């Protein structure tokens, strides 16, 4: 009938149009950390692959999607629905 799994991404709004923007050039002061409730797979190039119980450095969490950084100094996007700070 139907497998047992959570709903899809919370309507992602990081890209849709053909023309890109890219305006990264601002300072940020904060020391927060989030925790991925489960593991996810990088659906796009802007998104990041998170693991279960995986923690990262919270960068900017304003919209449905939050941005964090791993120990690899890498930064990506992830659905706040699959993540939960502690």
Curated annotation (Swiss-Prot):
Post-translational modifications: Phosphorylated.
Domain SH3: start-end pairs: 29-86
Modified residues (N-acetylthreonine): 29
Compartments, record wording: Cytoplasm; Endoplasmic reticulum
Tissue: Ubiquitous.
Assembly and oligomerization: Interacts with DOCK1, LIMS1 and TGFB1I1. Part of a complex containing PPP1R15B, PP1 and NCK2. Interacts with FASLG. Interacts with AXL. Interacts with PAK1, PKN2 and SOS1. Interacts (via SH2 domain) with EGFR. Interacts (via SH2 domain) with DDR1. Interacts with IRS1.
Entry function: Adapter protein which associates with tyrosine-phosphorylated growth factor receptors or their cellular substrates. Maintains low levels of EIF2S1 phosphorylation by promoting its dephosphorylation by PP1. Plays a role in ELK1-dependent transcriptional activation in response to activated Ras signaling.
Name of this chain's protein: Cytoplasmic protein NCK2
Species in which this protein is naturally found: Homo sapiens
From-to range in the entire protein, with total length: 1 to 59 of 380
């Amino acid at each position: 009938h139907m497998k047992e799994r959570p709903p899809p991404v919370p309507n992602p709004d990081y890209n849709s149009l053909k023309k890109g923007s890219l305006v990264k050039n601002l300072h940020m002061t904060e020391e927060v950390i989030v925790i991925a409730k489960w593991d996810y797979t990088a659906q796009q190039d802007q998104e990041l692959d998170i693991k279960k119980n995986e923690r990262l450095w919270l960068l900017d969490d304003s919209k449905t999607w939050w941005r964090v950084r791993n120990a690899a100094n890498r930064t990506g996007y992830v659905p706040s629905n699959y993540v939960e700070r502690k």
